[PDB]
Structure formats: structure tokens, C-alpha cells
Design a protein around this ligand. Structure first.
Ligand SMILES: O=P(O)(O)OC[C@H]1O[C@H](OP(=O)(O)O)[C@H](O)[C@@H]1O
Ligand SMILES: O=P(O)(O)OC[C@H]1O[C@H](OP(=O)(O)O)[C@H](O)[C@@H]1O
Ligand SMILES: [Ca+2]
Ligand SMILES: [Ca+2]
Lengths: 541, 541
């Protein structure tokens, strides 16, 4: 009996027939109405297909929903991950309020602070040269071993904050079970000067198991002494018992709690590889940026709340226009893994077919998130954004100031960013094109023939999110905005954003198939569908 | 009056209600019927929502269409890029047939062969050390400067064939106007030992202009002698006149013809950076692989023609199921830029709203292409593929044998690949889950409460394309399959796959905005919409 977001009312707000050009021409307060600021982030949603009436209707749905209660429940540690009976407390990992928070018998403020102090001490000991390898040498390289949430957030952040690297360590990310991943690291590191991190909440992920065992075999092939493990491995894991079976001391094991989802874990000890690149001070700045957005999100009325507006716009489009994807276009090379990261956060959260009560929902939930770095994407897929016939909401991320003095490059980068949202809004009509082709020197026949092919419909929506700079703090704020967008969408859809039951089956079938690959007399082999059986046969012959 | 692909007939083939499990159970010839082989590529489309009747209907549409004629027209050099009155001859770049081909007065076989011999000689002269920089030193680094089709194909191929690198040169790719891109190269190269490639068909792309000028300024800041340009720059361009204004001799200018689209250009002299990484012999192998697929595509009846089947399945889904995206999942780390590459090839080709006659089409055309490397994607977005409520066709790319001896890693990689397509097909029912939860130790209440959340609907389609290995030849074959898929889809939709008029407007608006940024009394500034005006104001303040 939760409120229905995608109802008849929404599907009919569309009938306002918003024309963006007309709105900007007639409403001199358009930008003021449909933009917000949070510190040095400017959120301009004024090129969206909205007016006052549509935004009001959307905000009413939010106000009528359980959202206000759910925000409080998330921050207070209520078990909002209902199918796993877990709290959802990535927010606590970056808290600066120091308000009381006791969850499941633990003082969360103490737990989080003490674990940060441990990671900080590890990083300082390694960077200072107090940590030595087994043969007595200073560490020069860090290799993170993990997949999904134990890989992508740290990898994305390390790249995004490349200008802030300052520890003299090189940080490498091993993830896929495809041994190419492990080999790219091993080919450029020395066992005597490398610290390996096993990043695994469960300590039983197939890929990370094989990678970690293989890395240990490489280390021990070199040293020929099991005692070397102590100087060359640390672990992060919620499952402290499996860490000791692998051979790692508790003093080299870092905590991860059940209330930290993998795809919300970069803020935890899982982010230690971030700290090993940019230093612990900068890691604190990253967390502080996120905290600023957490405070905004928790305290701000919905009509002025950036993540709530992001969520309402996205769910409005996917409900009313039946769009099945959203495009995210970061106009900075440093953000090259940002789409990949948000794919995980968004799609694994909101790709759900049942509501909290377990009922199959009759409305569409999470859509495909995709995109690409600008300006490059302009020469790859923006043709489709401009002249295709797919409805796709677009977010642009712009960074006002970069990390260098090529000011002509930076100005062109921004001009392009802004031109692309302007082009989506305006398009170009048959009459504009036809007249332009005549002025180019085409005769009437030629111009008539070509003009239709150059028509760009326009009236296509976008949001632009402008940062003053891409720093640890502003990046942390940017990520947190999207974390909260995703939460709001899940609440409005009445789904559990924080479980992931859909992946279990493939893990089981994978074990079965590996058995079938190694024994064709097995029940596993006999029960295969014939597509799977012949694929296995082809990778033997 | 072209044939309509997405007609009432198609929209109703859906009513067959294909159940994949039932089909594999009842049809012991399912795989034989719905798989094809081309040399050492195995194409298994048997997990698609098809049976004999649906495939027959689809093949009838292809047979009734202009496709047979259009294939001949493409290879013969007819002006199938109708809006630009151009031939479309990327196929000729890799030809091994040596059949007669005279287009626009040129002997295409002679033109292509002579240009290859020039690139081969350049690569040998640089690799051998006969090419010296201006101070007399051997080259160690190659920097490609280009964007879109002048960047992504070469970048993707160089990564994909990393195990085959053999020239002792490091190859770097500068593309975005964001100066981070140029700086990542300049920070690790020495002007005295670097050869720079300006890859630009037009020689007037904004980004490449700024990058090339900036690179020249860096070179000349070092040498302080304009004569050094001759030893440190080469150009690829269809526009030989602009190359000389930049300062580059014709002897250092490589050809590009109008009939080579940018997004089909890696096979041309634009691919020289590929050759500088893997050697010219391996570049020939890459072209030979593509040729093998060109011969397959041109000569094979439609029912056994892999690109035609790929196209029919894709357009069937996007017509009948109204899907708006397709997922491409390469199970090899080396293919990390393959989705990015195919996004350009597919979306910039088929993101079109008018037919060849210029009429607005009433059916959906090109959809969003996205995806991600496996197994990593399993921990990011496969949750949505399994339990979301979006219909998304899925292609898996598997490689039977890798480039190392971690056979346990490779077997797990493949088991996962096959498990994921198997999981999409089968899913898991409420009854299976409920019974499993009881056997796990949950009581009836608990199992009832959780079971619905673990239901995986299944009956979701996939294709698996299996290569024996990822070599220059097999990669070339793989890319060509998709080039021809895209061509077939465009023909069936009656669109021009080979123009890109939609990007022009944003280039114009970008020039206007840059003027507005530098002069607020300009007409450009006064004509801005207020969203654009305030974004410009915010990146000054
Ligand atoms: O080794 P651990 O950190 O336990 O798990 C690794 C990753 O696997 C999970 O994905 P999924 O839930 O399998 O889709 C998360 O992405 C998590 O970070
Ligand atoms: O410098 P040149 O090679 O002339 O062009 C660079 C790139 O720009 C084009 O994109 P679009 O047509 O602008 O979307 C192609 O991707 C081309 O390779
Ligand atoms: Ca209320
Ligand atoms: Ca026919």
C-alpha cells in the first residue's frame, strides 16, 4: 500500500508539451527557478522538460511518499535493507556530525573512527619506509586485489585524483579472473617491494580467491619462505575467520561491516588503496566532500534538495516517456571511470522486479546507465543523441578549472560542454538548414534534397552539474549526490536498493559448469542445455 | 517505397511465446539450426527468442529487401553514402581479392597497395633506427593526435593486441581537447625521441587543431628551431593542402580518401599507430582477418551469413520488444575498449531519424550500445540483466585460449561467461528458491518472506561469439562482423549509415559560445539562452 509514483497522473504531465526554447524566451526566471547550489557545485536542471506545474506535481509525489521517513531511517541505522535485515550506513563512514549512533550493539562513531586511525597508521608506516618487505626493502608498489565494489570505486577515484598523487607509491588494480589482469600488475612489480591488499568483504569471491592465491604463489615462488606473507599482504574483510586460513594475521586485517554495501564501500577501509595514492589527508577530504552532501540531503526541503530533484527528473522520464536509458557525460579526462562506477551503483541497486513486499511491480524500475567522456563522445555517439529517435535523458558534468595552464584547451572544453546542451535544446529546423544551404552556394534543388537530412529536432533535455574544480572534496560531494539520487529513486519505486539477489544463480551455474568442463560423466555435464555443452566442447577442441 | 522491416507482421512474431528451456528440451537440433562457423569463430545464436518460423520470417524480410543489391553496390564502389554522394569503401582497405575496382577515376587496388607500402616503409625506417630525430637520436615513442575515428580504433586495437607488441616503441593516444590528454603523453615523452602523428581526415577538427598546435609548441620550446618539425611530425589526411600550412612536407603526409569514413578508418593509414605497436606484418594479419569476413558476408546466402543474422536479431528485438539498448559483454581484459569502439561505429551510423528519401521514419532506428568486460560486469550491472525489468539483448564475446599459462584462471573465465548466458536462459522459479531456502535451514515463514526476492525470471536472450584466440587476424574478423551488422541494419531501416549530419550544430554553437565567453558585448553573448549565459558566468566567477 505504498504510494504509486508511476501513476496515470504522471503519464499525463507530458501533455503540457513543454517547449524549451519557448520557456526560456517567455520566462526570465527560468534559470533561477530550475537551478540550485551546494557550496561550489552548481546544479542547472533548467534544460529539462519541466515547468512549474510539472515540478510541483513531482515534488508532491515525493512529499506524499515515505521518503522523509526513509531518509531518517537510513541515517539512524534502521534496517532498511529489508531482505537481508541490515542497516545501510555508508553515510556513517564519512560522518563529521559525531551525533550518537549505536547500531547492533556497536558505537558506530567509535568503530568508524578507530578503523580510520588504523588505515591512516598503515599508510604512514608504508609511505615513511617503516614498513619493510621480508628482505628489508621499502615498498614502492601497492596492488589491490578485488572485484566489483572492492575494485571499481578505488580505481575510479585514484584516476580521478591523479593530480593529487603524492606518496611515491604506484597503485595497481587486479580484478578480473582473466589472468591478464593479475599479469598487468605482476609484469611491472617486484615481490620484494610490493604490498598486496586483498579487498574482500566475504573472502569467498571466486575471482578474488583465484587472484589472491596466484599472487601468493608468485610471492612465495620468489621468497621460498611462507613467513614472507606477513610483510607483503594485508586484507580488508567483514569475515575475519577466512582471513586467517589464507595466512594473514589479525593485525594485518582491516574491518568491513555488514552495513557497508560493496557498491557503497570506497569510503570504508576498502578505500585504502585511494589513501596509498593521494595520502590519508586527501582521503579525509574526499570523505568530507561526501559528508557535505549527506548534510544537504538530510536537512534540505525537497524543492531545494539536489539528489531529490535528480531522482524525480530521472524517474519522471523513465515513467512518462518510457525511456530505458540515461546518458552521463563527464567533460574531464580524469573522470574516465566515473560512468563505469555509477553503472554499478545505480544498476545493481535499482535493477529489481519486486517491491519490498515481494510483489512483482507493474512499472519499470532501474534503467541502463551509460555515457562517455566529453569532448570525445561528441565524435562517437552524440550523433544519436542529436538525430536518433530514442528518448534519452542527459547529465553533463563540467569542471570550471582544471589542473594546468592550457587555458585555451580548458575554455574550448567548456564551450563544447555548453554547446552540446544548447544543441540538444535548440536543434535546427528545415527552414534554417534550407536557407543556410542556399547561402553556402547550393542551388534550390540540391538544398531541397539535402536539408531534411540535416534537421535536428531539438527540445531534448539535459542537466548540467558544474564543479569549481575536481578535487578530493568535490569528487566526494559529486559521488554522494548520485548515491542519494539512487536511494530516492528506490524509495519512490518501493524497491530494496541495497540487496542483489539476482547474481546468485550465475555463481552457482558457474560452479556446475566448471565441474562439467572437467568431467563429462558428471551429472552437471549431463544436465546441461546443449548450447552450454557445445560451447564447452568447442573450448576443448 | 522501400520494404518496411518493422511492420505488423514482425510485431506479431512475438506471439509465438518462445520459451527457451522448452525449445532446448524438445528440439535436439536447436544448436545445429541456430549456430554458424566462420573459420575459427563460432557464432551461437541458439539462446535467442527464435524458432524456425520466426527466423524464416526474418530471413524473408532480408530476401525481400534491397540488401542483396546494396552488398554488391558497397563492394563495387557505388555511391551508397547518398547524402554526401560518396562511395563507402572501408572494405577495399583490407582487400585480398585483387579484383578490378576503379572509383572516381582511381584504381583503388593500386591506391590502397601503394599507400600501405608507404606506411610499411615509415614504420620500418622508424623501428630500424634509420629515422632519427632532429638531434640525431632514435625514436622511442609515438604519439597519435586525433579524436573519434582518428583515435578510438587504433587505441582499442593497440590494447587488444598488447601481447603482440614488438617494435620497442611506446605508443600514446592524445585526443580530448581537455589538456589532461596531451599532458599524459607529454609528461612521459622526450621531444628528441618522439614521433608525433596528426591523424585528421579534415585537418580542421577543433580538438586536433588545438592539440597539434600545443604539441608543436612543446617541440619547438625544446629545439628552438622550426626545422625540427620535419623529423618529429607526420600527418594522415584527406586534405593535403592544410597539412602544408601546418608545416609538414608532402613526403610526410599519408593519404586518406573521402570513401573512408572516420569510424571505419582504422584499416587505413589512420591505423599506422597500430603498426608502430605490433609491426606491419601483424597489421597485415589484422586486415586479412577482416577480409575473411568481408568474403563471408559478400558471398554467403543470408540464412548462413553471420552479420545478416546479427542484424536481423538486433532489429527484431528493437522492433518487436521495443528495446532501446543492447549489451555487449567481452570476456577478455584485452577488449576493454571494444564497447567504446562499437558505440562509435554503431550509434553514429544508425542514430538517424530520416530515411534515404529524407522522410521522417515512424519506426525506431539505432539503439544505445553499452556493456562491459566480464567477469567484472557480473559484479556491476548483471544484477539488472537478471532481475531488472528492462528487455535488453545480450552478446557475449568469449576467447577460448588466452596468452598465458594460468589455465585455472582461463577455465573460470569461460565457465563464468557460459554460466551467465545459461542463467539468463533458465532463471530460477519461486518453487525452486523456496525449496532451496528450506534446505538451507530457514523455516517456512522466513523462506516465504524471502523467496520472491530471489526469483529470476529467465527466458532472456543472448548470443555467444567464441573465438579460438584473440590474435591480429581474429580481432580483424570480429570487428568486421560488427561493421557488416551495422550496414545490414541500416539497409533494412532504409537509412544512410554513412553520414553524420547531427554533429554539425554543436560545432557551430561551440564557436559562438567561445566568442561569447571572450566578449560579453557580442551578438553571440546577447543571443544566448540564459542557461548557457549563467554557466559561462559561473566559469568566470
Ligand atoms: O569479495 P567481496 O568484496 O565479498 O565481493 C566483491 C564484489 O562482489 C559484489 O558483487 P555481486 O554482489 O557479486 O554482484 C560487490 O561488487 C563486491 O564488492
Ligand atoms: O580530424 P578528423 O579525422 O577529420 O575528424 C575526427 C573525427 O571526427 C569525426 O566525428 P564527427 O563526424 O565530428 O562526429 C570522426 O570520429 C573523425 O574520426
Ligand atoms: Ca508528507
Ligand atoms: Ca529478393
Amino acid at each position: 500500500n505504498a504510494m504509486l509514483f508511476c501513476d496515470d497522473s504522471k503519464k499525463y504531465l507530458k501533455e503540457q508539451n513543454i517547449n524549451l526554447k519557448n520557456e526560456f524566451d517567455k520566462d526570465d526566471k527560468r534559470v533561477e527557478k530550475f537551478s540550485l547550489k551546494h557550496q561550489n557545485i552548481y546544479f542547472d536542471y533548467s534544460k529539462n522538460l519541466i515547468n512549474d506545474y510539472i515540478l510541483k506535481s513531482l515534488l508532491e509525489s515525493a512529499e506524499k511518499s515515505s521518503l522523509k521517513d526513509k531518509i531518517k531511517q537510513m541515517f539512524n541505522g534502521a534496517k532498511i535493507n529489508s531482505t537481508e535485515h541490515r542497516a545501510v550506513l555508508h553515510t556513517a563512514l564519512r560522518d563529521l556530525s559525531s551525533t550518537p549512533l549505536i547500531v547492533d550493539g556497536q558505537d558506530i562513531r567509535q568503530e568508524v573512527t578507530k578503523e580510520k586511525q588504523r588505515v591512516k597508521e598503515l599508510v604512514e608506516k608504508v609511505v615513511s619506509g617503516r614498513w619493510r618487505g621480508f628482505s628489508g626493502k621499502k615498498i614502492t608498489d601497492i596492488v589491490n586485489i578485488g572485484i566489483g565494489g572492492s575494485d571499481l570505486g578505488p580505481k575510479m577515484v585514484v584516476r580521478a585524483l591523479q593530480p593529487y598523487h603524492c606518496t611515491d607509491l604506484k597503485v595497481h588494480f587486479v580484478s578480473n579472473v582473466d589472468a591478464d589482469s593479475l599479469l598487468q600488475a605482476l609484469h611491472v612489480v617486484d615481490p620484494e617491494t610490493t604490498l598486496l591488499i586483498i579487498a574482500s568483504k566475504s573472502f569467498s569471491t571466486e575471482e578474488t580467491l583465484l587472484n589472491s592465491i596466484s599472487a601468493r604463489e608468485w610471492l612465495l615462488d620468489h621468497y621460498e619462505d611462507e613467513k614472507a606473507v606477513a610483510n607483503h599482504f594485508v586484507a580488508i574483510s567483514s569475515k575475519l575467520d577466512k582471513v586467517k586460513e589464507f595466512g594473514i594475521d589479525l593485525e594485518h586485517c582491516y574491518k568491513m561491516w555488514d552495513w557497508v554495501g560493496g557498491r557503497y564501500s570506497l569510503w570504508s577501509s576498502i578505500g585504502m588503496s585511494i589513501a596509498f595514492a593521494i595520502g590519508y589527508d586527501n582521503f579525509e577530504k574526499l570523505l568530507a566532500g561526501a559528508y557535505s552532501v549527506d548534510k544537504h540531503f538530510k536537512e534540505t526541503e525537497f524543492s531545494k534538495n539536489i539528489p531529490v530533484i535528480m531522482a524525480l527528473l530521472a524517474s519522471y522520464y523513465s515513467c512518462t516517456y518510457n525511456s530505458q536509458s540515461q546518458a552521463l557525460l563527464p567533460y574531464d579526462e580524469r573522470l574516465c571511470y566515473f560512468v563505469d562506477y555509477l553503472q554499478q551503483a545505480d544498476m545493481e541497486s535499482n535493477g529489481k522486479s519486486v517491491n519490498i513486499a515481494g510483489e512483482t511491480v507493474n512499472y519499470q524500475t532501474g534503467v541502463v546507465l551509460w555515457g562517455g567522456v566529453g569532448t570525445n563522445g561528441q565524435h562517437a555517439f552524440h550523433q544519436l543523441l542529436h538525430q536518433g529517435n530514442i528518448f534519452i535523458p542527459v547529465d553533463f558534468i563540467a569542471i570550471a578549472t582544471s589542473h594546468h595552464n592550457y587555458d585555451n584547451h580548458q575554455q574550448a572544453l567548456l564551450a563544447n560542454c555548453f554547446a552540446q546542451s544548447q544543441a540538444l535544446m535548440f536543434g535546427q529546423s528545415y527552414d534554417m538548414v534550407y536557407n543556410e544551404l542556399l547561402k553556402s552556394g547550393l542551388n534550390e534543388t540540391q538544398a531541397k534534397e539535402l536539408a531534411a537530412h540535416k534537421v535536428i529536432p531539438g527540445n531534448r533535455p539535459s542537466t548540467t552539474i558544474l564543479l569549481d574544480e575536481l578535487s578530493p572534496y568535490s569528487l566526494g560531494a559529486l559521488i554522494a549526490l548520485y548515491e542519494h539520487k539512487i536511494f530516492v529513486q528506490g524509495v519512490l519505486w518501493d524497491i530494496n536498493s541495497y540487496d542483489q539477489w539476482g547474481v546468485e544463480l550465475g555463481k552457482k551455474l558457474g560452479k556446475n559448469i566448471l565441474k562439467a568442463m572437467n568431467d563429462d560423466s558428471s551429472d552437471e555435464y549431463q544436465n546441461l542445455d546443449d548450447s552450454t555443452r557445445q560451447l564447452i566442447a568447442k573450448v576443448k577442441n
